[PDB]
C-alpha cells in the first residue's frame, strides 16, 4: 500500500497536469462550440479570452 | 442570515415576549433564521425569523426578551449574510457567545466572515481512523484509547479529579498533537467562572484556547446556540494544517434548553414537549467525530449525561461513539491516588483481536486479567484467611499491585497544580511494562517504586531504590 | 486531451435542444412556503400523488389536494425557499428503477448513486411501492436455511415464503453481530435487499468494506439512508425499497427485502404528520401503521404459477416464484409493546426476540433461551435438521431449568448432573461466535455428538480444542465423502456409517 | 377577504339577480361602496360600529348613495351578518365570476400581458399573436425568446 | 354498491385523503347506504354517503380508493340503496367483501339481488321460545347446553383448530340437522387463504360454506364492509326452511377499524382508546343471531379480547 | 350573501327588507342524523316538542338567535 | 490494493476535471454574455417571427 502510495500520487498528479494542459483545448473548443452554436448570431467577433 | 440593515423598513402591529406578530415591509425578509438587526428601543436587537409565511409578516424571535417595546417598532432586515467573527487565529483570547469579549480581554483574533458554516466531513476524507497519541500515560492511553478527533464522551460524578483532566490534557492537547485549541465556557459562574479561569489561566490551559462564554440568565437560544459559532468558530483550526480541540459543556443543556425552549414557545411541538427537528441535528454528530480532509476537531466532551449517568439514555450514545467506556468514581482516589481514572471500570471497546494484534491486545488481557484475577484473589484471601494464598494470590500483591496501581501519576506541565511534572509516555511502557511485568518478572517490585512514575516501564526497571 | 468525448456530447447535445414552451399553460403557483409546506394554489386537478418538480432536483407531491391549495413535499432544502418560485409542470410520479439488473450494487434513496459508479441500470424506471401477492397462489416451498449461526441453523429456520419477526437487542449487537450470512452463504442467488434507515460513514464504510472482502458483493441490494433524511427517504425505506425484489418474485426466481430498524420508519414520519394537522393516534400516528405494514411485511410471500403466470407477460409461467421475508427490527433492550410492535410482530408468522444479558456479558449466545423462535422451525430443511437436530427446548429448558435452581435445592442427583455437563457443554461450545461462519457442516457434525454419544466423553472446556480440531480435521480429511453427505437430506446408512465410523474412529483415534 | 365566502356572493348574484338588468349595478356599487372605504377614514370609523344600521346606512347611503335594492340589501345584510368588513376581492371576484360567459383572456409569450380575445384553445392567438401589426414590445419580447436554448442548453449541458 | 337510475348527480370539489367530499346534487341528496358510483380514474368507485349536508358536499367515505383522481370527479345518482347481489346460492365458492367471489368466476353464485342492509332483531313472527340445541358430542353437548340459533363464545388456545371445528361440525351438524353453515373472515393473512383452503378439499365443505374473507392488504372501509355479506346472505337460507350458521374471525378488524375510523374521523367518542359505536353495533349485531320460526340463526361468536382487558 | 344559501343567500342579499320567519316553523338546514339545526323558528319555545318529518317528536336544544339545534 | 489504486485514480481524474464547470461556465457565461453585439434588428426577426 505504501508503494501504491506515490504511484497513486502520481497518477492523480499525471491526471490534474493533463486535465490543466487540456483547460487551452477544452476552453477553446467550448467557445467555438457556443459561439458557433449559440442560437443567436454565428460570429466569432467578441473574444472570449478564457483559460 | 442578515447583516446589518436595510431593506426600507417595518412596522410592528403587536407586541410581545418573545415570539411576537413582526411584520415588515411587502416583499423584504431574507431566508430562514434572519436576524434582523433593528433599533428595538435602545439596543440594536436581532430578531430571527425562523417562520416565512409571505413576505414580512414572519415570527421573529431575539436572543432575549423584547417585551417592553411599544406598538410600532420599525423592524428592518438585509441582504447578505450574517458573518461571525471567526477563525484560526482566534485561540489564546476570551471570546463571547457573539464575537466579543468574555472577560474585558481580546476578542476574536481572526476573522474569516464565518457566517454560520457548519463544516461537517463527508465519506470522501480521513473516515475512519483511530489516533492513540501521547498524553503521557500508560493505562489511560493504551487501556481507553480515542479516535482521530471523535467526541470522548466521559462520565463521572462529583470528586472525579478536575485537575488531572485539564492538567493532564492541557499539555497533550496544546504541545503534543495541535496548538490550536478550544474551550467552551457555557453555562458557568462565580465558581465556574473563577475556578476555570484561575486554574485554565494559572497553569497552560490558556494560551493557546480559544475560550468561549455564555451566560444562561435569558432566553436559551443564546446561551443554547453552540452549533454555529461552536461548530464555526472551534473548528476552523484544523484547516490550517493540523488538527483542533475544543471542550463542551453539559449532555443537559441540550435536551433541557432544546426542549424547554422549542416547548416553552408555541411552535414545533407535537412530540410531549420533545423537538422532533433539532435532535435529528445529533444524526451529524457523525460527520463531527471523525478525521476530516484538513484536519480533526477533537472536540473533547466533559463529564456529563443523564442527570450524571453511565448507563442510560445519552451516556450510552456518548459511550458507544467512541473507543471505550465512560466511568470515573471515588473508589480509585480514595484508596490514596494522583489521577482519579478507574481501570478496571473503563475498558476499551475496541479490545478484541480482529482490529488490534498481539501487542495491541495483549496490553488488555493483562490488565483485564491482572486487574480481575489482583483484584478478586486479593480480596478473596484479604476478606477470610491468609493461608489460602497460592501463587496468583501471593503474588498479586506486588507485581499486579504496582504494575495495575501505577497508572495514578502527575500530569505533563504539573509545575503549579501537582507539584511535580509528570514525564510523556508512549505506547511502548504500558505494553512493556505492563504485558510482562504484571505477573512476575522483578521478583520483587513494590508499590513504592511504582506510585510516583509517569510509565510502566520504570516500575520493573527503577525498583532496585525502591 | 481531457474532453475528447465531452466535446461531441456537450456539442451535440448543446447544440440540438429542442424548442420553447412556457406559453399559455399553468404551471402551478405556490402562494407561501412555510419551509416545506408550500401552498401550491394551482394546477390541482391531476394525479393524486404526483411528485411534480419545482425549481431544481425536488420532488413535491400533493399532500392534500383541496378545491383551491395544496401542500408540497419537502424534497431537500426547503428553508431557504421563498415565496415567488412558483412551481413547474409535471405529470411524473414515483420514476426509480425496477430490475434484476442492477440488484448488486450499493442503492442509494431514489436511486444507485451511493456507490463509485452510478450507472446501474435496471429493467425499467417503474414505481418502487409492492403489493400483496396472491391468496390462493401463495405456495410457499420449504427449502433450507443457513445464515451464520451453529445453533440457529437447526433450531427454527424460515426458508422461503415465511415471515420472522427478528428482534435484535442493543449493545453487542443489532447492526451487525450475526452478519456472517453473505460469508458464511457464499453465493445466495436471490434478489435481495438490505434497506437503511439513518446510516453513517462507519457502518457504510464496515459494511461496505467487510461485504465485499468478506464474501459476495455484487449479490443483493443494498438501498442506503442517510441521517439527514425527513420523510421521503427515511419514512419511504420499507414501502420503497421493494423495487427489485419485485422483479424476482413475479417472474418465477427467488427473491427477498430485509430492512433496518423499525424506530426510524414509525418515528421518521410521526413529525410530518403532527407537525401539518393531520391525524394522529399511537406515537403520533394514527391508521400509518396498519397500511404501511400490510404492504411490505405481509407482502414478500412465495408465488406459486398463477401469481406469476400473468404478472411475467408470458416468460417463466412453470417456475414458483419465491420470496423471503427477512422483517428485523432493532429493539432498545426490548422496547416491543405498542400498536406497531404487536400488529407488526403477531400479524406476520414467527417472532424472534433476542435479549442482550447473554450477548452482552461475554458469552458467544446472541439469541435467547426460548424466546427466540419462527413459524416453519426446523422441519422445512434438510432431513438431518429435522428428525435428528431439534431438541434445543428440551437440553435448554432441562439444563436451565434443572441447573438454574441449584442455589437453596443442592444435593443433585443422576438426573440433575447429567444435563449440566451436556448442556453447558452442548450449549457453550456449539454456539457459534461474533462473524464466525457456518457452513452446512452443522447438522453432520451436530445430528452425530449430540445423537449417539460421542460428546459425552470430552465434556471438558479444555477438550473441545484438540478435540474438535483433530476430530474434525482427521475425520474431514482422512474422508471427503462424507462432505457430500451435507449435499442433500440424509439421515440413513451413510449417515449412521459415517457418523458412527468417523465419530468412534475420529473420537476414539484423538 | 371572504376566500369562501366570496363563492356566495359572487356565484348568487350573477344568476338570480342577474334577470332585473343588475349588469351595471354590481360594478359600480360594488366598486364604489369597497373602494369609497379604502382610505383610513371610512374603514376605521365604520368597521368599529356598535349595530348594522349606522354602518350600513352611513356607509351605504352617505358616500353617494349611489345604490338602490342591491346596494342596501346587500349592504344590509352583510354589513349585518359580517362580509361588509373587507370586500375587496368584490369586483374580481363578481366580475370574473359573471362575465363567465364570454370571458376571452389568453397569457404571456414572456414579455407583458397582451390578453388576447381567445374564448377557446387557440382561437385569437395564433393570428392575433402571429399577425404582426405587433411582433415584439419594448417589455423584454425578443430578447426572452433566448431563454429556452440558453437556459436548456446551458442548464442542461451544464453538468458534463 | 347501488343500483344507479340517471347517472347525474354533478362535479366534485376537495379529494384530500379518504374524505369523499364530492359536489354531487343540490337539494336531491340520496340515502345513507345509497353510494354514488363516481368515475373517478378508470374503475367506478362507490363512495357510501355517512352524513348528507346542504349544498352538494357530503360527508362521504369510500372503501378503497380513487385510484389517482382530480379535485373535480364526475358522479352519479343511484335509486336502491345497498343493491349488492347474494341469496342462499353462495354455497359454492368462497365469496369476498362486495357480494364477489375469491377463488373462481360466479360472484360466489349469482342467483338473487336485494338490499344488503338486512334486519337486527325483531320479534312477533320470530321464535321467543329460544330452544337448545345438540351438536351430537359427548364433550360438547353433554358438557354444554347450546341453544337453537346462538352466539356462543369461544375461548382458550389451540389444540383443537380450524380443521377440527370446521371438518367435524361440516358433517355431523350438516347431516343431523337441515341448514346450510357459512363462514367470514375479517383480518386474516394473505398466505393462510393458500393453505387452509386447502382443508376445503379434505373435509368437502367448499360446496356447503361460502367463504367471505377480507384479508388485511386493504385499508379498513374496503376489508370492514364484510358484514353486509353474511347478514345479506344468511337471510336467504334462515328465513326459507334452513338454519344459516356463520363464524367470525377475529374482533381486531372491526374494533380497530370502528375505533379508529370512528375516532380518527375528528370527532370524540368513547374513553380508553374506545369508540361510541360499540353498543350499537355489538348490541344490534349480537341480538340479531336469533331463533326464528323459519330458521335458527346461529353464528360462531369468535371474537378476540385485548389479551383479558 | 356571505354564506351559500342559494334561496336565501339571493332573496336575502336581494330583499332584506322582507324575511317573515315568526311562524315558527320553515324547515333545516342540513341533517347530519340527529344533528340537525332547524332553520328559523323566532316565536318557537325553547326545548318544546314539534313533530318533523315522520313520526318522532323533535325538541331543540336551545334558543340561540335562530340557530336551534333540533334532535 | 490494485483496485483501490485503479478506482482512487478514476475516481481522482473523473472529479478533477473541471471542464464541465470551466468550460459550462466560461462558455455560458462569455456566449450568454457576448450575444450583444452584432445583433441590431436581425436578431429579433428570426427569434420573435417564429410565433
Ligand atoms: N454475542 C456476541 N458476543 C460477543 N461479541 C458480540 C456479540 N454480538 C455482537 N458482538 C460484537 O459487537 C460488534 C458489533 O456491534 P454493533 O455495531 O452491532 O452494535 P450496535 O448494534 O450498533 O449497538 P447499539 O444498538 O447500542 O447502537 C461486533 O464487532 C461483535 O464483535
Redesign the pocket.
Known amino acids: 500500500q505504501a508503494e501504491i502510495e506515490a504511484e497513486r500520487k502520481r497518477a492523480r498528479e499525471e491526471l490534474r497536469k493533463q486535465v490543466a494542459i487540456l483547460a487551452v483545448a477544452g476552453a477553446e473548443k467550448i467557445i467555438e462550440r457556443s459561439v458557433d452554436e449559440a442560437a443567436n448570431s454565428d460570429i466569432v467577433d467578441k473574444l472570449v479570452a478564457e483559460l | 442570515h442578515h447583516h446589518h440593515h436595510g431593506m426600507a423598513t417595518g412596522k410592528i402591529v403587536q407586541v410581545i415576549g418573545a415570539v411576537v406578530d413582526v411584520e415588515f415591509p411587502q416583499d423584504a425578509v431574507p431566508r430562514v433564521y434572519d436576524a434582523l438587526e433593528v433599533q428595538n428601543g435602545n439596543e440594536r436587537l436581532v430578531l430571527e425569523v425562523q417562520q416565512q409565511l409571505g413576505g414580512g409578516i414572519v415570527r421573529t424571535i431575539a436572543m432575549g426578551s423584547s417585551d417592553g417595546l411599544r406598538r410600532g417598532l420599525d423592524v428592518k432586515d438585509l441582504e447578505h449574510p450574517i458573518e461571525v467573527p471567526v477563525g484560526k487565529a482566534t485561540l489564546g483570547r476570551i471570546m463571547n457567545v457573539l464575537g466579543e469579549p468574555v472577560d474585558m480581554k481580546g476578542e476574536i483574533g481572526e476573522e474569516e466572515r464565518w457566517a454560520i458554516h457548519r463544516a461537517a466531513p463527508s465519506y470522501e476524507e480521513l473516515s475512519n481512523s483511530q489516533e492513540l497519541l501521547e498524553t503521557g500515560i500508560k493505562v489511560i492511553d493504551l487501556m481507553a484509547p480515542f479516535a482521530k478527533g471523535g467526541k470522548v464522551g466521559l462520565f463521572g460524578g462529583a470528586g472525579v479529579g478536575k485537575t488531572v483532566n485539564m492538567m493532564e490534557l492541557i499539555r497533550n492537547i496544546a504541545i503534543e498533537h495541535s496548538g490550536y485549541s478550544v474551550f467552551a465556557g457555557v453555562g458557568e459562574r462565580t465558581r465556574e467562572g473563577n475556578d476555570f479561569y484561575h486554574e485554565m489561566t494559572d497553569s497552560n490551559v490558556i494560551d493557546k484556547v480559544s475560550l468561549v462564554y455564555g451566560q444562561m440568565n435569558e432566553p436559551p437560544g443564546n446561551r443554547l446556540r453552540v452549533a454555529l459559532t461552536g461548530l464555526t468558530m472551534a473548528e476552523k483550526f484544523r484547516d490550517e494544517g493540523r488538527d483542533v480541540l475544543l471542550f463542551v459543556d453539559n449532555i443537559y443543556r441540550y435536551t433541557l434548553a432544546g426542549t424547554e425552549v422549542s416547548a416553552l414557545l408555541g411552535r414545533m411541538p407535537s412530540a410531549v414537549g420533545y423537538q422532533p427537528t433539532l435532535a435529528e441535528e445529533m444524526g451529524v454528530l457523525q460527520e463531527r467525530i471523525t478525521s476530516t480532509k484538513t484536519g480533526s476537531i477533537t472536540s473533547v466532551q466533559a463529564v456529563y449525561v443523564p442527570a450524571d449517568d453511565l448507563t442510560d439514555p445519552s451516556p450510552?450514545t456518548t459511550f458507544?461513539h467512541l473507543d471505550a467506556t465512560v466511568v470515573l468514581s471515588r473508589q480509585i482516589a480514595s484508596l490514596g491516588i494522583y489521577p482519579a481514572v478507574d481501570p478496571l471500570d473503563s475498558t476499551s471497546r475496541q479490545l478484541?483481536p480482529?482490529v488490534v494484534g498481539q501487542e495491541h491486545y495483549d496490553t488488555a488481557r493483562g490488565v483485564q486479567s491482572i486487574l480481575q484475577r489482583y483484584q478478586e484473589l486479593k480480596d478473596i484471601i484479604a476478606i477470610l484467611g491468609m493461608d489460602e494464598l497460592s501463587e496468583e494470590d501471593k503474588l498479586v500483591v506486588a507485581r499486579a499491585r504496582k504494575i495495575q496501581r501505577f497508572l495514578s501519576q502527575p500530569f505533563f506541565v504539573a509545575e503549579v497544580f501537582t507539584g511535580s511534572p509528570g514525564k510523556y509516555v508512549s505506547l511502548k511502557d504500558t505494553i512493556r511494562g505492563f504485558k510482562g511485568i504484571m505477573e512476575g518478572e522483578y521478583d520483587h517490585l513494590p508499590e513504592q517504586a511504582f506510585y510516583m512514575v509517569g510509565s510502566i516501564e520504570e516500575a520493573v526497571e527503577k525498583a532496585k531504590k525502591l | 486531451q481531457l474532453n475528447s468525448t465531452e466535446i461531441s456530447e456537450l456539442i451535440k447535445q448543446r447544440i440540438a435542444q429542442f424548442n420553447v414552451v412556457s406559453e399559455a399553460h399553468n404551471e402551478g403557483t405556490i402562494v407561501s412556503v412555510s419551509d416545506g409546506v408550500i401552498r401550491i394554489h394551482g394546477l390541482a386537478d391531476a394525479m393524486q400523488g404526483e411528485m411534480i418538480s419545482l425549481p431544481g432536483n425536488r420532488y413535491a407531491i400533493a399532500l392534500n389536494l383541496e378545491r383551491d391549495s395544496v401542500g408540497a413535499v419537502v424534497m431537500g432544502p426547503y428553508a431557504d425557499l421563498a415565496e415567488g418560485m412558483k412551481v413547474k409542470a409535471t405529470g411524473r410520479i414515483l420514476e426509480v428503477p425496477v430490475g434484476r439488473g442492477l440488484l448488486g450494487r450499493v442503492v442509494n434513496t431514489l436511486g444507485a448513486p451511493i456507490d463509485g459508479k452510478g450507472p446501474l441500470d435496471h429493467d425499467g424506471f417503474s414505481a418502487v411501492e409492492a403489493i400483496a401477492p396472491g391468496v390462493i397462489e401463495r405456495q410457499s416451498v420449504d427449502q433450507p436455511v443457513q445464515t451464520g449461526y451453529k445453533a440457529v441453523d437447526s433450531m427454527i429456520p424460515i426458508g422461503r415464503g415465511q415471515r420472522e419477526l427478528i428482534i435484535?437487542?442493543?449493545?453487542?449487537?443489532?447492526?451487525?453481530?450475526?452478519i456472517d450470512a453473505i460469508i458464511n452463504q457464499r453465493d445466495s442467488g436471490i434478489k435481495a435487499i438490505y434497506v437503511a434507515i439513518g446510516q453513517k460513514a462507519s457502518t457504510i464504510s464496515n459494511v461496505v468494506r467487510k461485504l465485499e472482502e468478506h464474501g459476495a458483493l455484487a449479490n443483493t441490494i443494498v438501498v442506503v439512508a442517510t441521517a439527514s433524511e425527513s420523510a421521503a427517504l427515511q419514512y419511504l425505506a420499507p414501502y420503497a425499497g421493494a423495487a427489485m425484489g419485485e422483479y424476482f418474485r413475479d417472474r418465477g426466481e427467488d427473491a427477498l427485502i430485509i430492512y433496518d430498524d423499525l424506530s426510524k420508519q414509525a418515528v421518521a414520519y410521526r413529525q410530518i404528520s403532527l407537525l401539518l394537522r393531520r391525524p394522529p393516534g399511537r406515537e403520533a400516528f394514527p391508521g400509518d401503521v396498519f397500511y404501511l405494514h400490510s404492504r411490505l411485511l405481509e407482502r414478500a410471500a412465495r408465488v406459486n404459477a398463477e401469481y406469476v403466470e400473468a404478472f411475467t407477460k408470458g416468460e417463466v409461467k412453470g417456475k414458483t416464484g419465491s420470496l423471503t421475508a427477512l422483517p428485523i427490527i432493532?429493539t432498545?433492550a426490548g422496547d416491543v409493546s405498542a400498536f406497531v410492535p404487536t400488529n407488526v410482530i403477531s400479524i406476520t408468522d414467527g417472532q424472534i426476540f433476542l435479549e442482550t444479558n447473554?450477548?452482552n456479558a461475554?458469552?458467544?449466545?446472541?439469541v435467547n433461551p426460548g424466546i427466540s423462535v419462527s413459524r416453519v422451525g426446523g422441519a422445512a430443511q434438510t432431513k438431518i435438521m429435522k428428525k435428528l437436530s431439534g431438541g434445543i427446548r428440551t437440553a435448554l429448558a432441562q439444563y436451565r431449568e434443572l441447573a438454574a435452581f441449584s442455589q437453596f435445592a443442592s444435593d443433585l442427583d443422576d438426573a440433575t448432573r447429567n444435563q449440566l455437563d451436556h448442556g453447558q457443554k452442548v450449549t457453550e461450545l456449539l454456539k457459534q461466535?461474533?462473524?464466525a461462519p457456518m457452513s452446512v457442516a452443522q447438522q453432520s457434525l451436530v445430528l452425530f455428538a449430540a445423537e449417539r454419544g460421542y460428546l459425552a466423553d470430552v465434556e471438558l472446556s479444555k477438550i473441545g480444542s484438540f478435540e474438535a480440531a483433530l476430530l474434525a480435521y482427521v475425520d474431514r480429511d482422512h474422508a471427503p465423502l462424507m462432505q457430500e453427505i451435507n449435499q442433500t437430506g440424509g439421515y440413513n446408512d451413510e449417515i449412521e456409517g459415517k457418523l458412527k465410523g468417523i465419530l468412534d474412529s475420529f473420537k476414539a483415534t484423538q | 377577504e371572504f376566500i369562501t365566502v366570496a363563492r356566495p356572493y359572487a356565484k348568487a348574484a350573477f344568476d338570480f339577480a342577474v334577470e332585473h338588468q343588475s349588469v351595471e349595478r354590481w360594478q359600480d356599487m360594488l366598486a364604489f361602496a369597497a373602494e369609497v372605504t379604502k382610505n383610513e377614514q371610512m374603514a376605521e370609523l365604520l368597521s368599529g360600529a356598535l349595530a348594522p344600521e349606522t354602518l350600513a346606512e352611513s356607509f351605504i347611503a352617505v358616500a353617494g348613495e349611489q345604490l338602490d335594492e342591491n346596494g342596501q340589501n346587500l349592504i344590509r345584510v352583510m354589513a349585518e351578518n359580517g362580509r361588509l368588513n373587507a370586500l375587496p376581492d368584490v369586483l374580481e371576484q363578481f366580475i370574473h365570476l359573471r362575465a363567465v360567459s364570454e370571458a376571452t383572456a389568453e397569457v404571456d409569450v414572456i414579455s407583458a400581458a397582451a390578453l388576447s380575445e381567445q374564448q377557446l384553445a387557440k382561437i385569437s392567438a395564433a393570428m392575433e399573436k402571429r399577425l404582426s401589426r405587433k411582433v415584439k414590445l419594448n417589455a423584454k419580447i425578443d430578447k426572452s425568446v433566448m431563454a429556452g436554448v440558453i437556459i436548456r442548453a446551458g442548464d442542461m449541458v451544464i453538468d458534463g
Not at chain 3, 362 to 366: D, E, K, Q, V
Open positions: 450510552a458507544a478484541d480482529l | 435484535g437487542d442493543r449493545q453487542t449487537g443489532k447492526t451487525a453481530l450475526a432493532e432498545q447473554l450477548f461475554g458469552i458467544r449466545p446472541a461466535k461474533q462473524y
